[PDB]
Amino acid sequence: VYSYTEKKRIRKDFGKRPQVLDVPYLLSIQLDSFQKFIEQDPEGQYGLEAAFRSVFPIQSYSGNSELQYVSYRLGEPVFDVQECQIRGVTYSAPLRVKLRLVIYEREAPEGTVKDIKEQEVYMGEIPLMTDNGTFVINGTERVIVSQLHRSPGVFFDSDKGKTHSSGKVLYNARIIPYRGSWLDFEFDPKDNLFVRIDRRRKLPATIILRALNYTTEQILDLFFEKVIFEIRDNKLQMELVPERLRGETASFDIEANGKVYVEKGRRITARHIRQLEKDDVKLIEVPVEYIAGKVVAKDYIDESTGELICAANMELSLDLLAKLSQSGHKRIETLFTNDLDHGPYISETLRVDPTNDRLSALVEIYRMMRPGEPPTREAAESLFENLFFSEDRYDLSAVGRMKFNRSLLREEIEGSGILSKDDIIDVMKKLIDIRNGKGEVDDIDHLGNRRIRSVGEMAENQFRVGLVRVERAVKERLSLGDLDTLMPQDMINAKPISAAVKEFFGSSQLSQFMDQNNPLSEITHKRRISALGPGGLTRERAGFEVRDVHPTHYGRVCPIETPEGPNIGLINSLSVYAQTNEYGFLETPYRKVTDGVVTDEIHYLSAIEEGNYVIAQANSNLDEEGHFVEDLVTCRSKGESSLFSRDQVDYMDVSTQQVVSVGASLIPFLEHDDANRALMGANMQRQAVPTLRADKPLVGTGMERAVAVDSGVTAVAKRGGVVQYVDASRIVIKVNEDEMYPGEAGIDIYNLTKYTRSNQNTCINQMPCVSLGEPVERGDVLADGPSTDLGELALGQNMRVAFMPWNGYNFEDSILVSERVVQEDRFTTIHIQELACVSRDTKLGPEEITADIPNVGEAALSKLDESGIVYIGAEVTGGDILVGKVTPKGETQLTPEEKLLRAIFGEKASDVKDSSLRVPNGVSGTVIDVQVFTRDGVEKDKRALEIEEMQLKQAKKDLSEELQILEAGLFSRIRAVLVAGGVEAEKLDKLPRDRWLELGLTDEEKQNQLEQLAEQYDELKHEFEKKLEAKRRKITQGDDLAPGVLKIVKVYLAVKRRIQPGDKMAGRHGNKGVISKINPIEDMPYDENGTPVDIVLNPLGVPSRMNIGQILETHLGMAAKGIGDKINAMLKQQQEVAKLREFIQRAYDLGADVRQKVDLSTFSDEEVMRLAENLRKGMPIATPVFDGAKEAEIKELLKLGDLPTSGQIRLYDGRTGEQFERPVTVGYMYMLKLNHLVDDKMHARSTGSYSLVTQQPLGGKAQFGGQRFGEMEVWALEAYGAAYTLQEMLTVKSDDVNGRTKMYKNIVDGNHQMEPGMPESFNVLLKEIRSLGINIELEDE
Amino acid sequence: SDEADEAYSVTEQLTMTGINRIRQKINAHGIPVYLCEACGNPIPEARRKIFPGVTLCVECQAYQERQRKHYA
Amino acid sequence: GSSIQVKNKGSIKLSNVKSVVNSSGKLVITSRNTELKLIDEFGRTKESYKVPYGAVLAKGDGEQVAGGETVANWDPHTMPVITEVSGFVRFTDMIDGQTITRQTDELTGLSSLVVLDSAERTAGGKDLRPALKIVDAQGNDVLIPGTDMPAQYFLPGKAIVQLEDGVQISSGDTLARIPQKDITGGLPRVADLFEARRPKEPAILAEISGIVSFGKETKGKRRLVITPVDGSDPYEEMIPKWRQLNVFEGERVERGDVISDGPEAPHDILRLRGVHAVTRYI
Ligand SMILES: [Zn+2]
């Protein structure tokens, strides 16, 4: 059940699993986040409404001067997108707010209002989001990478080991809020427990308990369990709770009933506790020595005196037992301490507690928060209440409360805003229990502690900071507040908020240039998480902790796609099915499980909600109904993974792909690659430059179509219909009768984007693929972009590789590319460089853009027209002129004998200095397009007038073609008027269309309908008169250029770089390479049938770097081209549709269980010929990533062709014509072309420009300056005895500004001497030391 | 050499040293002990027969392992 | 990660003392951590030797040995398998191709069923355990003292056997015989070499060649005392007694021989032995 578009070539699809969650729209992060940002949102939640409800209303100094909020608006831009890339504006959208300045009357708190002046005030231009989540800030398409930062809540950290040298670990616990004072708990190595408010001094941690209305009795009964001792007529009985005695010294005879069930000295093993439980002991009679070290909880005083016998939390010695014996107590309370489990911590910290009771504790808090402030009753009350208990001065965000209740094993995920007695006490219990053995510590990386921002929330915060810095000014201008003379816009300033928001979108560690050199690059750049930036941890502070992968990445961030090198792991790329949760933490799909069934309901899980479940594994064969095939299946429960019984799973992975990203899920046979290698593979697939004829992955992974379509490059049909008029520019879809709106149907039209620059200087082209008179279904591609083909992402080209050494040309990783790959121009990649030539305004005068140039005859000026700009199309080369420009330079200041010379030949020395924009030395191109911006203070020249006329012709053509469709829709609606009630069918197609307004009709509601539709027609008329007026006026106006520039002339060269020894190349699995000798055809190897193997890689790179996936891909490719050549023979020897059907059907079934059966008996006889003609280059093959095609499937798919099952053909060398012993592997591997081109990298500099502060080399153009002869190189030269080369390496070649010119004079005059002198850098050092008062001089002898 | 080759060497180093630590722990050589090195209880047959020459009863082992779980 | 040749005269002593009287009366050592103390007649220690496991002895507590009686013996590679209980023997689970193999010594004349390891056996005796089970005269296993747990001796692979079935056994009888530093080698070990950082516990080394004794007793640091041939004697130095001495009260040591142990810091060697010595250390 396929469409008519999908049948262009139906990708053979292995992969055994059924997909149950189709791939989400890959750009959900950017789009949905910026959608939450900018929208009138009738609820106080996120969006701009959040910021405005936060900072407004502004009340003055209580003076009945208020400025409140009403509602805002997003006026449409003045320049739309492509206009805004041409000209250079920020694709903004002017903001508007309805602020409402109210002024209450004095002698009135809320008495009668005296003025409510309601006026709408401008502020800022928020740069809107394109349809592809890519803003346009200054002409270039920029992208704001999602950030990943610590969620405000609670954290229990270790800081294990190194401190204190005893090895003993500390267990600190931090309560970070959204906004307010922190709170920390920590152990000392002496094991007492201490607190600290915001990172200030430590404190005896019981002081905060006491400050919260806790005296020692209830402290000890919160942080401890009770053991009562009894004095029942003889010597110190004890309560026996049976499980109190696991792992403890038996320092006494544990008898019972006068029977000995446990004996002294031993240890109470589980046997003993078992037997005491079975033998029912409850009150054991132990000696006094065992109470001698116990601790007494409650307070005891002589009941006859009221004098304090034992304070709370004192150790009972024998004397105190005696003393309270004579007071009439048979109950005694003792803390159940223990070295293992119920440790003494709060008790011994009370030992450390200097203070005694509540008021003293509040005093100490007041003296630790701020010194010098004398303590006080109410000062202490206010300070302590306002640390953690002030709704104004402290608020966990609701995210804060949610983490704080999920990390305590609480109940409600949402609740209060400030802390409480119970929140603090639960923190402390959790802390002590962490240290007691039960419980564990949340390591940093755990994605339950990495809330994900994105464009929306970050821009919201920047607008927030803007609002605070402006409400300062608002309250200030309200200080002087005249009641009714300042409207609600002189209080504000617009440029503040615009400054903040532009600073974010244009200067950030996030808002960065789109890696727009390959559709996979954009859609793997917009899906991106970053841990750097403002508010995240940067490298120095942190640090190795967050580089790591952590088992909560399984389906939430890709593990095998992260930028290797300087910052690994800080650029985690988001998974395939991942999402941002409601609160923010990354979440992912999982299929629900009933009693024992695998439901098809996908259910989302965040990070903190997972471990309490037990998730199955997607690689589980299930039994045609939703029951597993076994009773025990692999699963993963809490980090660990293991076998579980069938009746225990709760969640199955949505699909085998979800562990990866869109980066590494395109690598076919990813499953057989060492993870570093898939890392480098994805990170070299993000850089493939779009070739000239982008072919297709001959072996793909299923996700490639979704990446091509969901990225913006393909030209996706908005509505299904017939194709009326294709063309290299535009595609005209005639919408069908059912997908067609009721009024003014019309037809959809797509203006493609022909040749044009992207940021990385490549060609972002679009070519139609659906030809004239041809159906298209909704949601289908019309026009392939760069590196797409038929809507299947084709980054590089497939080609014939043969693994074999072949004379050292591929030594380390080098590659040997036969000239059949470069003759065809199949890696010939097109690069569209932009050269600008401004025309500035110096003190001497304005630069000219004349065609009149000195010291260059007609020679270099043959390509220039009458005005100094080159023609569109002249094939400039290295060193020619594109824009003739001359600057007036007075004071020629003639010299000696040069003056004699001018006398000798009378040649008038000109007043003008040539500065024309000449092509960079080396490129060789075609000037595809010249644009001339002009300050509107200059008379536009002749060529700019040509350009204005031409663009205006174009825009007139376009907008008139638009008006035609529109009026056709309105005539349609007119017929829809007549069709009901008195339509005259054939009396309306004969006569002219324009004379339908005067068509007869009875004066019912339908005559008034005709009148109304005539009104609509004339409105459209005047509308497009005035709209073409506005188009002509946008074109005709001057530009608004930088300060002091007359006119800029942009010239778009279009180089075509082919391929040449040095151009890096690479497969997908991470086999790099540097194509190293572009061999003839004859020389290459050739299999017994004749075909020369185009590339020749190296065998020594498959075992050493375990990326055997490239050998399996090579074999699947060889089988694929086997099928291809079989269809080619069946089609060239032209057979029929019948043989083709039987053979393609044999290819598409092919054995093992698959989810792809197509049944070509429904393809019409003429579709299968088209299907063949698209397969005649070779049958594509899918292979979902961790669910690929196992080897034996490949072997049978080879045997379906006629290749040898071994995969290894016997090759004959091309030069000697004699068989390679030991057959080689040959196949069709898909190889990219990385854009580390050679001619971008090559560089050489003999005498260029120079610096200005130190006479060193400095060039610009391609760092047109010498290589850095750094320090380690100087160590090298000193290691050799060579010292002359060093002396000239930093005296003659580099700095000594007489040494270098004398060296050049000597070199030209054929005397290789050198006259060093002394470096100008050291002379600067003498001056910089001497400006300080340090007289450094050089002795002279 | 490449940047993944060096990472392979480091991964070999890391897992080899970890595994060889944990094989250094387990004894596999008899020194028949017959009752604890701390508590004195008899070590049962099954435990002394799995791990030959193990000085400590089961409970003493769990207890020392738990005091060491907080890393000394 | 091959016997104690006593040299001097004096009484004998053991600390951490534990051993068993073998059938030959030799008070053969079962304990590991016992140490032998060669005492002079003063009542103070002369020399010390850390007891080998299952070593052979002749002398005992508080008795004079003279220089030359090699009392403390130990088989240099073999790990003795002595047994304290008194009884007879049977062999259970020692089967050809399964746990042991048929192994005949031709130089002794008796066969030794040297226990075969986890890689030398097949599925017929894979999980099986070579068990030397002690018995009484009845054929019942002699209980070991202090357990309701019989006496059957476990033998890992590679263990050469002393005697076969039918052999009576008693204490101090090795049934079996099994054969017999942290060199942090990163780069940061090399940086910390050239930086010459003083280690954690400096291997305490002498000052001068001369006789010794012990002085002021542990006001924190117990004090060593060093007096020359005849010269500048007054040096007596603090020493954390929290780590062992490898010296005795009456030794005339050469300067530059370890009193204690540990990675000796380089400053010590340079000031004590000579520059050649320290450069060879590094
Ligand atoms: Zn024990």
Pairing relation of β-strands A193-197 and A203-204? antiparallel
By C-alpha distance, the chain B residue nearest A170 is: B70
Q: Rounded to whole angstroms, what are the CA distances from A190 to A169, A201, A202, A315?
A: 11, 17, 14, 19
Q: In whole angstroms, give the CA distance from residue A698 to residue A701.
A: 10
Considering only the beta carbons, identify the residue of B2, B5, B72 that sits closest to A168: B72
CA distance A193 to chain B (A): 16
Cβ pair B39:A266 closer than 8 A: yes
Chain B contact for A266, CB < 8 A? Answer: yes
A135 has which bridge partners? A142
Interface of C with B in 170-229 (CB under 8 A): 178
Q: Are A947 and A907 in contact (CB under 8 A)?
A: no
B61 interaction partners in chain A (CB closer than 8 Å): none
Method by which the coordinates were obtained? cryo-EM
Phi, psi of A1205 (to 5 degrees): -60, -30
Q: Distance between terminal CA atoms of chain B?
A: 42
Query: Separation of B38 CA from ligand 1 center, angstroms?
Result: 5
Chain B contact for A437, CB < 8 A? Answer: yes
C20 has which bridge partners? C28
The HSE-up count of residue A974 (CA atoms within 13 Å, CB side) is: 25
Chain C contact for B44, CB < 8 A? Answer: yes
How far is Cα of residue A1008 from the mean position of the Cα atoms in its chain? Answer: 57
A1226 has which bridge partners? A802
CATH of A831-947+1044-1056, one of 2.40.30.170, 2.60.40.10, 2.40.50.150, 3.40.50.970: 2.40.50.150
Q: Are A1148 and A1138 in contact (CB under 8 A)?
A: no
Which residues neighbour A715 within 8 Å (Cβ) at sequence distance 6 or greater? A731, A750, A752, A766, A781, A782, A783, A784, A785
With the C-alpha atoms ordered B45, B49, B53, B57, is the resulting torsion angle positive or negative?
negative
Q: Are A875 and A926 in contact (CB under 8 A)?
A: yes
Considering only the beta carbons, identify the residue of B24, B30, B45 that sits closest to C156: B30
The residue of B39, B41, B61 whose CB has the most chain A CBs within 10 angstroms, and thus the best one to mutate to test that interface, is B39
Which residues neighbour A936 within 8 Å (Cβ) at sequence distance 6 or greater? A1037, A1038, A1039, A1040
Q: Distance between terminal CA atoms of chain C?
A: 21
- DSSP codes joined into one string, A369-419: HSSSS---HHHHHHHHHHHHS-TTT-B--HHHHHHHHHTTT-S-SS--SS-
With the C-alpha atoms ordered A816, A822, A826, A827, is the resulting torsion angle positive or negative?
positive
Burial of A30 (0-12, 13-18, 19+ CB in 10 A): buried
Q: Which residue has the tokens 């779980």?
A: B69
Q: In whole angstroms, give the CA distance from residue A846 to residue A1045.
A: 9
Phi/psi region, residue A1070 (left: phi>0; alpha: psi -120 to 50; beta: rest), is left
- Angle made by CA atoms A1288, A1292, A1296, in degrees to the nearest 5: 130
Q: Rounded to whole angstroms, what are the CA distances from A879 to A245, A919, A920, A1239, C51?
A: 92, 5, 7, 16, 90
A333 has which bridge partners? A228
A1100 interaction partners in chain B (CB closer than 8 Å): none
Q: In whole angstroms, give the CA distance from residue A577 to residue A607.
A: 14
The HSE-up count of residue A728 (CA atoms within 13 Å, CB side) is: 3
The HSE-up count of residue A624 (CA atoms within 13 Å, CB side) is: 1
Query: Separation of B63 CA from ligand 1 center, angstroms?
Result: 9
Pairing relation of β-strands C88-92 and C131-135? antiparallel
Q: Tokens in use for A184?
A: 């920390």
Q: Distance between terminal CA atoms of chain A?
A: 98
Phi, psi of A732 (to 5 degrees): -115, 95
The HSE-up count of residue A1023 (CA atoms within 13 Å, CB side) is: 10
Chain B contact for C122, CB < 8 A? Answer: no
Query: Separation of B62 CA from ligand 1 center, angstroms?
Result: 9
Chain B contact for C147, CB < 8 A? Answer: yes
Cβ pair B49:C129 closer than 8 A: yes
Cβ pair B42:C149 closer than 8 A: yes
Q: Which residue has the tokens 């003055």?
A: A60
Q: Are A513 and A759 in contact (CB under 8 A)?
A: yes
The secondary structure element, H or E, covering residue B44 is none
Q: In whole angstroms, give the CA distance from residue A1319 to residue A1298.
A: 10
* 3-state SS assignment for residue A295: strand
Phi, psi of C128 (to 5 degrees): -70, 155
Neighbours of A840 (CB within 10 A): 15
Neighbours of A556 (CB within 10 A): 26
CA distance C149 to chain B (A): 7
Cβ pair B39:A267 closer than 8 A: yes
Q: In whole angstroms, give the CA distance from residue A604 to residue A608.
A: 12
Cβ pair C156:B28 closer than 8 A: yes
Resolution, angstroms, 1 dp:
3.8
Residue type for position A981:
G
Chain B contact for C149, CB < 8 A? Answer: yes
The residue of A267, A339, A811 whose CB has the most chain B CBs within 10 angstroms, and thus the best one to mutate to test that interface, is A267
How many beta-carbon contacts under 8 Å exist across A and B? 57
Chain B contact for A1047, CB < 8 A? Answer: no
By C-alpha distance, the chain B residue nearest C158 is: B29
Q: Tokens in use for A1102?
A: 């498959």
Considering only the beta carbons, identify the residue of B24, B34, B45 that sits closest to C1: B24
The secondary structure element, H or E, covering residue A742 is none
Q: Tokens in use for A1193?
A: 């499937």
Q: Tokens in use for A585?
A: 């933490």
The secondary structure element, H or E, covering residue C57 is none
Pairing relation of β-strands A721-725 and A451-452? unpaired
Which residues neighbour A1073 within 8 Å (Cβ) at sequence distance 6 or greater? A810, A813, A814, A815, A1064, A1065, A1066, A1097
Q: Tokens in use for A1332?
A: 């300080």
DSSP structural state of residue A75:
P
Q: Are A935 and A1039 in contact (CB under 8 A)?
A: yes
A1072 interaction partners in chain B (CB closer than 8 Å): 2
Chain C contact for B28, CB < 8 A? Answer: yes
Nearest-CA neighbor of A83 among A1037, A1051, A1042? A1037
